[PDB]
Coordinates of C-alpha atoms and ligand atoms in Angstrom, one line a residue:
Chain J
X1 CA 38.4 10.5 -14.6
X2 CA 38.6 7.3 -15.5
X3 CA 35.5 5.8 -17.7
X4 CA 33.9 2.5 -16.6
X5 CA 30.8 0.0 -16.4
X6 CA 28.1 -0.4 -13.4
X7 CA 28.6 -4.8 -12.1
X8 CA 25.9 -5.5 -12.4
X9 CA 25.0 -9.6 -14.0
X10 CA 22.2 -9.3 -16.8
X11 CA 19.6 -10.6 -13.8
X12 CA 20.7 -7.6 -12.7
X13 CA 19.5 -5.2 -15.5
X14 CA 16.4 -3.2 -17.4
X15 CA 15.7 -2.6 -21.2
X16 CA 16.1 0.9 -21.9
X17 CA 13.1 0.8 -24.3
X18 CA 10.5 -0.8 -22.5
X19 CA 10.1 -1.2 -18.3
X20 CA 11.3 -5.4 -19.0
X21 CA 14.2 -7.3 -17.5
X22 CA 16.5 -8.0 -20.1
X23 CA 16.0 -12.0 -21.1
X24 CA 19.0 -12.6 -23.1
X25 CA 22.0 -11.0 -25.7
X26 CA 21.4 -11.1 -28.3
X27 CA 22.5 -11.0 -32.4
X28 CA 21.5 -10.4 -35.7
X29 CA 23.8 -9.6 -38.6
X30 CA 21.7 -9.9 -41.1
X31 CA 19.1 -7.0 -40.3
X32 CA 18.2 -4.8 -43.6
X33 CA 16.2 -1.9 -41.6
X34 CA 18.5 0.9 -40.5
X35 CA 19.2 0.5 -36.6
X36 CA 18.5 3.9 -35.2
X37 CA 16.3 3.6 -31.7
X38 CA 15.6 6.9 -29.3
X39 CA 15.3 5.5 -26.4
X40 CA 18.4 3.9 -24.6
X41 CA 20.9 6.3 -26.0
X42 CA 23.5 7.6 -24.6
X43 CA 27.0 8.8 -25.5
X44 CA 29.9 7.1 -23.3
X45 CA 30.7 10.3 -21.9
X46 CA 27.2 10.6 -20.4
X47 CA 25.6 12.7 -23.1
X48 CA 21.5 11.1 -23.4
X49 CA 20.1 11.5 -26.9
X50 CA 17.0 11.6 -28.7
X51 CA 13.9 10.8 -26.4
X52 CA 16.4 9.0 -23.7
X53 CA 15.3 10.0 -19.7
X54 CA 16.5 7.9 -17.0
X55 CA 13.4 7.2 -15.7
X56 CA 12.8 3.2 -15.7
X57 CA 9.2 5.0 -14.9
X58 CA 9.2 6.4 -17.8
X59 CA 10.0 5.0 -20.6
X60 CA 6.7 4.5 -23.2
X61 CA 4.7 6.7 -20.6
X62 CA 2.3 9.7 -20.7
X63 CA 1.6 12.3 -19.0
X64 CA -1.0 14.7 -19.8
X65 CA -5.2 14.7 -19.8
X66 CA -7.9 13.9 -22.2
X67 CA -9.9 16.0 -23.8
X68 CA -12.3 14.9 -25.5
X69 CA -13.6 11.2 -27.0
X70 CA -13.1 11.2 -31.0
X71 CA -13.9 9.3 -34.1
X72 CA -11.7 6.5 -35.7
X73 CA -12.2 4.2 -38.2
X74 CA -10.6 0.8 -36.1
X75 CA -11.9 -1.6 -33.6
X76 CA -12.7 0.0 -29.9
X77 CA -13.3 3.8 -28.5
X78 CA -10.8 6.1 -28.9
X79 CA -9.4 9.4 -27.0
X80 CA -7.4 12.4 -26.9
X81 CA -5.1 13.5 -24.9
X82 CA -2.4 16.1 -24.8
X83 CA 0.7 15.0 -23.2
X84 CA 2.8 17.0 -21.2
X85 CA 6.5 16.1 -20.2
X86 CA 6.9 13.4 -17.7
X87 CA 7.8 15.5 -14.5
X88 CA 4.5 17.7 -15.6
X89 CA 5.6 20.8 -17.2
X90 CA 4.6 22.2 -20.5
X91 CA 6.1 20.1 -23.7
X92 CA 7.8 23.1 -25.2
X93 CA 8.3 21.2 -29.4
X94 CA 10.9 24.2 -29.6
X95 CA 13.1 22.3 -27.6
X96 CA 15.8 20.3 -29.2
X97 CA 14.4 16.3 -28.7
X98 CA 12.3 14.4 -31.7
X99 CA 9.0 14.2 -29.0
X100 CA 8.9 14.3 -24.9
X101 CA 11.5 12.2 -23.3
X102 CA 10.1 8.8 -22.8
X103 CA 8.3 8.5 -26.1
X104 CA 7.9 5.2 -27.6
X105 CA 10.3 4.9 -30.2
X106 CA 9.3 2.3 -32.7
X107 CA 6.0 1.2 -34.5
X108 CA 3.8 -0.8 -32.8
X109 CA 0.4 -1.2 -30.5
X110 CA 1.7 -0.2 -27.2
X111 CA -0.6 -1.4 -25.2
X112 CA -1.3 -0.6 -21.0
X113 CA -3.5 1.1 -18.5
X114 CA -4.5 4.7 -19.1
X115 CA -5.5 6.3 -15.5
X116 CA -6.8 9.1 -13.7
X117 CA -7.1 11.1 -11.2
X118 CA -8.8 13.5 -10.7
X119 CA -8.2 17.5 -10.1
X120 CA -11.4 18.5 -8.6
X121 CA -12.3 17.1 -5.0
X122 CA -15.2 16.4 -3.0
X123 CA -15.7 17.5 0.0
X124 CA -18.1 15.0 1.0
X125 CA -15.7 12.7 -0.2
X126 CA -12.9 13.9 2.7
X127 CA -11.6 16.8 -0.2
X128 CA -10.3 13.8 -1.9
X129 CA -10.7 13.3 -6.1
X130 CA -11.9 10.7 -8.0
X131 CA -10.1 7.9 -10.3
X132 CA -10.9 4.8 -12.9
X133 CA -8.2 3.1 -14.6
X134 CA -8.4 1.1 -18.4
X135 CA -6.7 -1.4 -19.8
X136 CA -5.7 1.2 -23.5
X137 CA -3.7 0.6 -27.2
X138 CA -1.2 3.3 -28.2
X139 CA -0.6 2.9 -32.0
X140 CA 2.0 4.8 -32.7
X141 CA 2.6 4.6 -36.8
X142 CA -1.2 5.8 -36.3
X143 CA -1.6 9.6 -38.2
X144 CA -2.8 10.8 -35.3
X145 CA -0.3 9.7 -32.9
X146 CA 1.8 13.3 -33.1
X147 CA 3.3 13.2 -29.8
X148 CA 5.7 16.0 -30.8
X149 CA 2.7 18.0 -31.6
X150 CA 1.8 17.8 -27.9
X151 CA -0.9 15.2 -28.3
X152 CA -1.9 11.4 -28.8
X153 CA -4.7 9.3 -29.0
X154 CA -5.4 6.4 -27.3
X155 CA -8.1 2.8 -27.4
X156 CA -10.2 1.0 -25.1
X157 CA -12.2 -1.5 -24.3
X158 CA -13.8 0.5 -21.7
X159 CA -17.0 2.5 -24.0
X160 CA -17.9 5.1 -21.1
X161 CA -16.1 5.6 -17.9
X162 CA -12.5 7.6 -19.3
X163 CA -13.0 11.8 -17.6
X164 CA -12.8 14.9 -20.4
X165 CA -10.3 17.3 -19.1
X166 CA -8.4 14.9 -16.3
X167 CA -4.9 14.2 -14.9
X168 CA -3.6 11.1 -17.0
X169 CA -1.4 8.6 -17.1
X170 CA -0.3 6.1 -18.9
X171 CA 1.5 3.0 -17.5
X172 CA 3.1 1.0 -20.8
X173 CA 2.6 -3.0 -20.0
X174 CA 3.5 -5.0 -23.3
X175 CA 2.1 -4.7 -27.1
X176 CA -1.3 -5.2 -28.2
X177 CA -0.9 -7.8 -31.1
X178 CA 1.9 -8.5 -33.4
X179 CA -0.5 -9.5 -36.4
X180 CA 0.2 -8.1 -39.9
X181 CA -2.5 -5.4 -39.2
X182 CA -1.2 -3.8 -36.1
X183 CA 2.2 -3.2 -37.6
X184 CA 4.6 -4.0 -34.4
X185 CA 8.3 -3.5 -36.1
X186 CA 10.3 -2.1 -33.3
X187 CA 13.3 -0.5 -35.8
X188 CA 11.2 1.7 -37.4
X189 CA 10.3 4.8 -35.6
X190 CA 6.9 6.6 -35.2
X191 CA 6.6 9.8 -37.0
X192 CA 6.3 12.0 -33.9
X193 CA 4.3 14.9 -35.8
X194 CA 2.4 13.3 -37.4
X195 CA 2.3 11.3 -41.0
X196 CA 4.3 13.4 -44.0
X197 CA 6.0 15.3 -41.3
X198 CA 9.9 14.4 -40.7
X199 CA 11.3 13.2 -37.5
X200 CA 14.2 16.1 -35.8
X201 CA 17.0 15.8 -33.6
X202 CA 17.5 11.6 -33.9
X203 CA 20.0 9.7 -31.9
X204 CA 22.2 8.8 -35.1
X205 CA 21.8 5.8 -36.4
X206 CA 24.6 2.5 -35.6
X207 CA 26.0 0.7 -37.5
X208 CA 29.5 -2.3 -36.8
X209 CA 31.9 -0.3 -39.6
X210 CA 34.9 -3.5 -38.9
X211 CA 34.1 -6.5 -40.9
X212 CA 33.0 -9.4 -39.2
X213 CA 31.0 -7.4 -36.4
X214 CA 27.7 -7.2 -35.8
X215 CA 25.5 -5.4 -33.3
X216 CA 24.5 -6.8 -29.9
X217 CA 22.2 -6.3 -28.4
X218 CA 20.3 -6.6 -24.9
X219 CA 16.8 -8.4 -25.6
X220 CA 13.9 -8.7 -23.8
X221 CA 10.7 -10.4 -24.9
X222 CA 6.8 -8.3 -24.1
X223 CA 3.7 -9.2 -23.6
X224 CA 1.2 -9.2 -25.1
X225 CA -3.0 -8.3 -25.5
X226 CA -3.7 -11.6 -27.7
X227 CA -2.6 -13.9 -31.0
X228 CA -0.2 -15.2 -31.4
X229 CA 3.3 -14.4 -31.1
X230 CA 6.5 -14.2 -28.4
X231 CA 7.8 -10.4 -30.1
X232 CA 11.3 -9.2 -28.6
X233 CA 12.8 -5.8 -28.1
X234 CA 16.1 -4.9 -28.3
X235 CA 18.4 -2.0 -26.9
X236 CA 21.8 -1.1 -27.1
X237 CA 22.8 -0.9 -23.7
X238 CA 20.4 -1.7 -20.8
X239 CA 19.2 1.6 -18.3
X240 CA 21.3 0.7 -15.9
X241 CA 24.7 1.5 -18.5
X242 CA 22.4 4.9 -18.9
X243 CA 21.7 6.6 -16.0
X244 CA 25.6 4.9 -15.2
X245 CA 27.3 6.7 -17.9
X246 CA 24.9 9.9 -17.9
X247 CA 26.1 9.6 -13.6
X248 CA 29.5 9.5 -14.3
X249 CA 30.3 11.6 -17.4
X250 CA 34.2 9.8 -18.0
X251 CA 35.7 11.9 -20.4
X252 CA 35.7 9.3 -24.1
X253 CA 39.5 9.0 -24.6
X254 CA 38.6 7.4 -27.9
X255 CA 36.0 6.2 -29.8
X256 CA 35.9 2.5 -29.2
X257 CA 36.4 0.6 -25.6
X258 CA 37.2 -3.0 -25.7
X259 CA 35.0 -4.7 -22.7
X260 CA 35.1 -8.1 -21.6
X261 CA 32.3 -10.3 -20.8
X262 CA 33.7 -12.3 -17.4
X263 CA 32.3 -15.0 -15.2
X264 CA 33.3 -13.6 -12.4
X265 CA 33.4 -16.9 -10.3
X266 CA 35.9 -17.9 -12.2
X267 CA 37.1 -14.3 -13.5
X268 CA 37.2 -16.1 -17.1
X269 CA 36.6 -13.9 -20.1
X270 CA 33.5 -14.8 -22.1
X271 CA 33.8 -12.9 -24.7
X272 CA 34.8 -9.9 -25.6
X273 CA 33.0 -7.0 -27.4
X274 CA 33.7 -3.1 -29.0
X275 CA 31.7 0.0 -26.7
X276 CA 31.2 2.2 -29.2
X277 CA 31.5 6.4 -28.6
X278 CA 27.8 6.8 -29.8
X279 CA 27.1 4.0 -26.9
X280 CA 26.1 0.2 -28.5
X281 CA 27.6 -3.1 -28.6
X282 CA 29.7 -4.8 -31.3
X283 CA 31.0 -8.3 -31.4
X284 CA 33.3 -10.7 -33.9
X285 CA 30.2 -13.4 -34.8
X286 CA 28.3 -14.7 -37.7
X287 CA 25.4 -16.1 -36.2
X288 CA 21.6 -14.5 -35.4
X289 CA 20.8 -15.6 -31.7
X290 CA 21.0 -15.5 -28.0
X291 CA 24.6 -15.6 -27.0
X292 CA 23.8 -18.7 -23.8
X293 CA 26.1 -17.3 -21.9
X294 CA 26.4 -17.9 -17.9
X295 CA 24.5 -16.6 -15.3
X296 CA 26.8 -14.6 -13.5
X297 CA 28.3 -12.5 -17.0
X298 CA 28.9 -9.2 -17.2
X299 CA 30.9 -6.7 -18.6
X300 CA 34.2 -4.7 -17.8
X301 CA 36.1 -2.0 -19.0
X302 CA 39.7 -3.0 -20.3
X303 CA 41.0 -0.4 -22.2
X304 CA 39.8 2.4 -25.3
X305 CA 41.7 0.3 -28.1
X306 CA 40.8 2.2 -31.9
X307 CA 38.9 1.5 -35.4
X308 CA 42.5 -1.3 -36.4
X309 CA 41.6 -3.3 -33.1
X310 CA 40.0 -6.8 -34.1
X311 CA 38.3 -9.0 -32.0
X312 CA 38.5 -11.4 -30.7
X313 CA 35.5 -14.3 -32.0
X314 CA 32.9 -15.3 -29.8
Chain N
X1 CA 38.0 2.8 3.1
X2 CA 36.3 3.6 0.1
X3 CA 34.6 6.8 0.5
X4 CA 30.8 6.6 1.0
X5 CA 28.7 8.1 -2.0
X6 CA 25.1 9.0 -2.9
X7 CA 24.4 9.3 -6.8
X8 CA 24.0 13.0 -8.0
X9 CA 20.3 12.2 -8.9
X10 CA 17.3 15.1 -8.2
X11 CA 13.8 14.2 -7.1
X12 CA 12.9 14.1 -10.6
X13 CA 15.2 11.6 -11.7
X14 CA 14.4 9.1 -9.3
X15 CA 11.6 6.2 -8.0
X16 CA 10.2 4.6 -6.1
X17 CA 12.2 1.3 -4.6
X18 CA 8.5 -0.1 -2.9
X19 CA 5.7 0.4 -6.5
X20 CA 6.8 1.1 -10.3
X21 CA 6.4 5.2 -9.5
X22 CA 8.6 8.7 -10.1
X23 CA 9.5 9.7 -7.0
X24 CA 7.1 12.8 -6.4
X25 CA 8.2 14.8 -3.0
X26 CA 10.0 14.9 -0.5
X27 CA 7.3 14.1 2.6
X28 CA 7.6 13.8 6.4
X29 CA 4.3 12.4 9.3
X30 CA 6.1 13.1 12.9
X31 CA 2.8 11.6 13.7
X32 CA 2.5 9.0 12.2
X33 CA 1.1 5.2 15.2
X34 CA 2.2 2.6 13.0
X35 CA 5.8 0.8 13.0
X36 CA 7.8 1.5 9.8
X37 CA 9.5 -1.7 8.6
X38 CA 8.9 -2.1 4.5
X39 CA 11.0 -4.9 3.2
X40 CA 10.9 -3.3 -0.4
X41 CA 13.5 -0.6 -1.2
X42 CA 15.3 -1.6 2.4
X43 CA 19.6 -1.7 2.3
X44 CA 22.2 -1.2 4.4
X45 CA 24.9 1.7 3.4
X46 CA 27.4 -0.7 3.1
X47 CA 25.7 -2.0 0.5
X48 CA 23.7 -4.9 2.1
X49 CA 20.3 -5.5 0.4
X50 CA 16.9 -6.7 2.9
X51 CA 14.0 -7.5 3.2
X52 CA 12.9 -8.6 -0.1
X53 CA 14.9 -5.9 -1.7
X54 CA 16.1 -6.7 -5.8
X55 CA 17.7 -4.3 -7.7
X56 CA 15.2 -4.0 -10.5
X57 CA 13.2 -1.6 -11.2
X58 CA 10.8 -4.0 -12.7
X59 CA 10.9 -6.2 -9.9
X60 CA 8.9 -4.5 -7.5
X61 CA 5.7 -5.9 -6.8
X62 CA 6.1 -8.1 -9.6
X63 CA 5.4 -11.8 -9.8
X64 CA 5.8 -14.5 -12.0
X65 CA 4.5 -18.1 -11.9
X66 CA 1.8 -20.4 -13.2
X67 CA -2.1 -20.7 -12.9
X68 CA -3.3 -24.0 -11.0
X69 CA -6.4 -23.7 -10.8
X70 CA -10.0 -21.1 -11.0
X71 CA -12.1 -21.1 -8.3
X72 CA -15.3 -18.3 -8.3
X73 CA -15.9 -15.8 -6.6
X74 CA -18.9 -16.3 -3.9
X75 CA -19.9 -12.6 -5.7
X76 CA -18.1 -10.8 -7.9
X77 CA -15.2 -11.5 -9.7
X78 CA -12.6 -15.1 -10.4
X79 CA -10.1 -16.1 -8.1
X80 CA -7.0 -17.5 -9.6
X81 CA -4.5 -19.7 -7.7
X82 CA -0.8 -18.7 -9.0
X83 CA 2.5 -20.5 -7.2
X84 CA 4.9 -18.0 -8.0
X85 CA 8.3 -18.4 -8.6
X86 CA 11.9 -16.3 -8.7
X87 CA 11.6 -13.5 -10.5
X88 CA 14.4 -15.2 -12.7
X89 CA 12.2 -18.4 -13.3
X90 CA 13.9 -20.3 -10.6
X91 CA 11.9 -22.1 -8.0
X92 CA 11.7 -20.5 -5.0
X93 CA 13.1 -22.2 -1.7
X94 CA 11.0 -21.4 1.4
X95 CA 13.9 -22.7 3.4
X96 CA 15.4 -19.0 1.9
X97 CA 16.2 -16.7 4.7
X98 CA 14.1 -14.3 3.0
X99 CA 10.5 -12.9 3.9
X100 CA 9.5 -14.0 0.9
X101 CA 9.9 -14.4 -2.9
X102 CA 12.7 -10.8 -3.9
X103 CA 9.8 -8.0 -5.0
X104 CA 7.1 -9.8 -3.4
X105 CA 5.0 -6.6 -2.5
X106 CA 5.5 -4.9 1.1
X107 CA 2.5 -3.5 2.3
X108 CA -1.4 -4.8 2.9
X109 CA -3.9 -3.8 0.3
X110 CA -5.6 -4.3 -3.1
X111 CA -2.8 -4.3 -5.9
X112 CA -3.8 -3.7 -9.6
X113 CA -1.7 -4.6 -12.6
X114 CA -2.2 -6.7 -15.4
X115 CA -1.2 -10.6 -16.1
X116 CA -0.2 -11.2 -19.5
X117 CA 0.4 -15.3 -20.5
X118 CA 3.0 -16.7 -23.4
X119 CA 2.2 -20.6 -23.7
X120 CA 5.1 -22.9 -23.8
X121 CA 5.5 -22.8 -33.9
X122 CA 4.3 -19.0 -32.6
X123 CA 2.7 -19.3 -29.0
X124 CA -0.5 -18.7 -27.4
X125 CA -0.9 -15.3 -25.6
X126 CA -3.4 -13.4 -23.1
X127 CA -3.4 -10.8 -20.5
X128 CA -6.2 -9.5 -18.3
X129 CA -6.4 -6.8 -15.2
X130 CA -5.8 -8.9 -12.4
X131 CA -6.1 -7.3 -8.5
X132 CA -3.5 -9.4 -5.8
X133 CA -5.2 -9.2 -2.4
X134 CA -2.5 -9.1 0.0
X135 CA -3.7 -9.0 2.9
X136 CA -6.1 -12.3 1.9
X137 CA -5.4 -15.8 3.5
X138 CA -4.4 -16.1 0.1
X139 CA -2.2 -15.2 -0.1
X140 CA 0.9 -16.4 0.6
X141 CA 3.8 -16.2 -1.2
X142 CA 6.4 -17.6 1.2
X143 CA 5.1 -20.8 0.5
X144 CA 5.4 -20.8 -3.0
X145 CA 1.4 -19.2 -4.0
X146 CA -0.6 -16.6 -4.3
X147 CA -4.0 -15.9 -5.7
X148 CA -5.2 -13.0 -8.1
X149 CA -8.6 -12.1 -9.2
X150 CA -10.4 -11.7 -12.3
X151 CA -12.7 -9.5 -13.7
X152 CA -12.8 -11.5 -17.0
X153 CA -14.8 -14.7 -16.1
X154 CA -12.8 -17.7 -17.8
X155 CA -9.6 -16.8 -20.3
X156 CA -6.6 -17.2 -18.3
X157 CA -5.0 -20.6 -18.9
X158 CA -3.5 -23.1 -16.3
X159 CA 0.5 -23.9 -16.4
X160 CA 1.4 -21.5 -18.7
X161 CA 3.7 -19.0 -17.9
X162 CA 2.5 -16.5 -16.0
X163 CA 3.6 -12.4 -15.3
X164 CA 1.7 -9.4 -13.0
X165 CA 2.8 -5.7 -14.4
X166 CA 1.8 -3.9 -10.8
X167 CA 0.1 -0.6 -12.1
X168 CA -1.1 0.8 -9.2
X169 CA -4.2 0.2 -6.8
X170 CA -8.1 -1.4 -7.0
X171 CA -9.0 0.2 -4.7
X172 CA -8.7 3.0 -0.8
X173 CA -11.6 1.8 0.4
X174 CA -12.1 0.7 4.3
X175 CA -12.8 -2.5 2.8
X176 CA -9.7 -2.8 0.7
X177 CA -7.5 -2.2 3.6
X178 CA -4.7 -0.4 2.1
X179 CA -2.6 0.5 4.6
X180 CA 0.9 0.3 3.1
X181 CA 2.5 0.5 6.9
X182 CA 1.0 -3.5 7.5
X183 CA 3.3 -5.9 6.1
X184 CA 1.1 -8.6 4.8
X185 CA 1.2 -12.2 6.3
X186 CA 4.3 -14.0 3.9
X187 CA 2.5 -17.3 5.0
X188 CA -0.7 -16.9 6.4
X189 CA -2.3 -15.9 8.8
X190 CA -1.4 -17.8 11.6
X191 CA 2.3 -18.0 11.1
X192 CA 4.8 -15.1 11.8
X193 CA 7.0 -13.6 8.8
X194 CA 10.2 -14.3 8.7
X195 CA 13.8 -12.7 7.5
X196 CA 12.1 -9.0 8.1
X197 CA 14.3 -5.8 7.1
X198 CA 14.6 -3.5 10.8
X199 CA 11.6 -1.2 11.4
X200 CA 13.1 2.0 11.3
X201 CA 12.9 5.0 13.5
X202 CA 14.1 8.3 14.9
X203 CA 16.4 8.2 18.1
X204 CA 16.7 11.6 18.6
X205 CA 14.9 14.4 19.8
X206 CA 13.2 16.2 17.4
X207 CA 13.7 14.3 15.0
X208 CA 10.3 12.8 12.2
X209 CA 11.7 9.8 9.4
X210 CA 11.9 11.4 5.8
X211 CA 10.4 10.1 3.3
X212 CA 10.7 9.4 -0.9
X213 CA 7.0 10.4 -2.1
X214 CA 4.7 8.8 -5.1
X215 CA 1.4 9.6 -5.0
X216 CA -0.3 5.6 -7.0
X217 CA -2.8 5.2 -9.6
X218 CA -6.4 4.5 -9.1
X219 CA -9.0 1.7 -10.3
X220 CA -12.2 3.6 -9.2
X221 CA -13.1 5.1 -6.5
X222 CA -11.9 8.2 -4.6
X223 CA -8.8 8.6 -3.0
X224 CA -5.3 9.8 -3.8
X225 CA -3.3 7.3 -2.0
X226 CA 0.4 7.8 -1.4
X227 CA 3.2 4.7 -1.1
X228 CA 6.8 6.5 0.6
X229 CA 9.9 4.5 0.5
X230 CA 12.9 5.1 2.5
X231 CA 15.5 5.4 0.2
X232 CA 15.0 5.3 -4.3
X233 CA 15.3 3.1 -6.4
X234 CA 18.0 4.6 -7.3
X235 CA 20.2 4.4 -4.5
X236 CA 19.3 0.7 -3.5
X237 CA 21.4 -0.1 -7.2
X238 CA 23.5 2.7 -5.4
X239 CA 24.6 1.3 -2.7
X240 CA 24.5 -2.0 -3.4
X241 CA 27.1 -1.5 -6.5
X242 CA 29.5 1.0 -4.3
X243 CA 29.4 -0.9 -1.1
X244 CA 31.6 1.8 0.5
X245 CA 32.1 0.9 4.4
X246 CA 29.7 2.4 7.3
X247 CA 32.6 4.6 9.1
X248 CA 29.5 5.3 11.9
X249 CA 25.9 4.5 12.2
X250 CA 24.6 8.1 11.2
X251 CA 25.7 10.3 7.6
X252 CA 25.5 13.6 8.1
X253 CA 24.0 14.4 4.3
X254 CA 23.1 17.9 3.0
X255 CA 20.6 19.0 0.5
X256 CA 22.0 20.9 -2.0
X257 CA 20.5 23.4 -5.0
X258 CA 23.6 22.8 -7.4
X259 CA 22.8 27.0 -8.6
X260 CA 23.4 28.1 -5.7
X261 CA 25.5 25.5 -4.0
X262 CA 23.3 26.6 -0.6
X263 CA 22.7 23.2 1.5
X264 CA 17.9 23.9 1.9
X265 CA 18.7 21.4 5.1
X266 CA 20.1 18.8 6.4
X267 CA 19.6 15.4 7.5
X268 CA 20.8 12.3 9.3
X269 CA 21.5 9.2 7.1
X270 CA 21.4 6.1 9.6
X271 CA 23.3 2.7 8.9
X272 CA 19.9 0.9 8.2
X273 CA 19.5 3.0 5.0
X274 CA 16.9 5.7 5.6
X275 CA 17.2 9.2 6.7
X276 CA 16.1 11.7 9.2
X277 CA 15.3 15.4 9.8
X278 CA 14.8 17.5 12.6
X279 CA 11.2 18.8 11.2
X280 CA 7.9 19.3 13.4
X281 CA 5.5 19.5 11.2
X282 CA 3.8 17.0 8.5
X283 CA 3.9 17.2 4.4
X284 CA 5.7 17.3 1.3
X285 CA 9.0 19.7 1.8
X286 CA 9.3 22.4 -1.2
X287 CA 12.7 22.6 -2.9
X288 CA 14.0 22.9 -5.7
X289 CA 13.5 21.1 -8.5
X290 CA 17.1 21.3 -8.9
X291 CA 18.9 19.5 -5.5
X292 CA 19.7 16.7 -4.3
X293 CA 21.2 14.9 -1.1
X294 CA 25.1 15.1 -1.0
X295 CA 26.9 13.1 1.9
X296 CA 28.6 15.8 4.1
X297 CA 30.6 13.2 7.2
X298 CA 30.0 10.7 9.1
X299 CA 29.1 11.8 12.5
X300 CA 27.1 9.6 15.3
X301 CA 23.7 9.4 17.0
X302 CA 24.3 12.3 19.0
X303 CA 24.4 15.1 15.9
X304 CA 21.7 17.5 16.5
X305 CA 21.1 18.5 12.8
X306 CA 20.0 21.9 12.2
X307 CA 16.3 22.1 12.3
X308 CA 13.7 22.5 9.2
Ligands
FUL401 C1 -15.4 7.5 -8.0 C2 -15.9 7.0 -9.1 O1 -15.2 5.3 -9.2 C3 -14.9 4.6 -10.0 O2 -14.8 3.3 -10.5 C4 -15.4 5.0 -11.4 O3 -15.4 4.4 -12.7 C5 -15.3 6.6 -12.2 O4 -15.8 7.1 -13.0 C6 -15.8 7.3 -10.7 O5 -14.3 8.1 -10.5

């Protein structure tokens, strides 16, 4: 079965690591961090890895139940919540995943909305349940962030109106802050089972192996609750590529596919890239920053090549 | 002739095309009195997006634009006038043959979400809970402007890039006018909506619409509101990619349990992009979690579906 990519322009793609549209293609050859994100990880023959799942609505989302309000040193009102799988089934800690699928894969203060729909209904209200929602922050670097153990903590500005023992949903929206004290680092993984524990079942790190090459990212800018900053999240492949590769499950015929970024209105190749078996792109570029390219552009599979293939410089 | 196909995705791998939600259940309601003419999640079987439908899951019920003025509510809350652009930031051209900017909500209600702003050497930011009343006389996205309200009283900046991220509904009480089949007046109350995706309905006796249903969060109050889409967003995205020619007006599809290979039920998938089934009851369809629709063959309007 022939390998293919979807025909989607950048303006038709979304981030696989946070629910955002793709804004720009991006390189950073001088990146010092090990790149080992866990969302947006899929092999070219369609094997999801890390914490990756198919739903755009599942990325950095949680489902579970608040247990009780808890004490915490930091500002705000804090709440412990057990987490289940996104489909509501109990998360089985013995499953070979780093954490429940969809769990955030970076250090930071993730800002969003906690909402609740009570289990118990009221006869006088037409047998309908009570609801509430509030802004919330999940600090993924916190010792209380233990999604692999089945529970996490979130903070609210709201001081009281969060109910114990009721079905709870976290909808991600952005970051609370990127001040130094908020520990945003998109390449630093959470400790999924808590401080001092080793993460397990990780999707592997990715890196260029060929001289002059660097990773190519699909970049999205992420909203902020407050403060200064223009934070970005870089994914290895957009969510639609994850979904496509999973559907197709085309056999990988080598370790590296040659792909061309094409302007369809002209049919011309803007640049070429290597699409690696483990699901990431490299290009021959020696600068950092956005790739400035016509809006109609998209990647097209050209051929399977090998480790010795030399890319045309961008 | 390129063979027609549907993606192989279970219900638990699908999302709603009318609000950013996972699909929870398949659902029927034969006694529905309303005309069903939603504008998001509309796509013909040969891949033509219609209504306000666009491809991004992040675009559904989202807005992009800039705040122009603050107006205080007579009672409580603060309202903000927002000019809206296309989701890609280009100016919305009201003369384009669309009902409203693509992604615009397609129902009456108080849509709850978050407004965020990143100012035009690091930029200042703010975000707040916000509500967009799509039934409001000030909801005129086809004219390039809408209004949203905040509990926040002051900290929303004018002339700065603004994003609305939808989250759920503010309320479904009597005063909140939630009706998933009532279209907004995209240009205001005395103006006719234009360029709409057509209404959908069974045409054969004993049939009813089959919906992909999602439950939508609430900011407060009582309720268990749901949003029903005609096809999930992944089907829209698939049909658009494939652009397979439609060989009749109606495709026969089978809902299959792959683990047994057995057909659980069959359905008509109509050219304009919606399903009907032979069912005479309302409520969820109880089906194994591994189930998904598979194209069987092209049939016609007179085909008799096996009763569910
Ligand atoms: C029914 C009530 O609606 C309000 O908005 C909520 O704040 C309460 O917790 C409760 O659910």
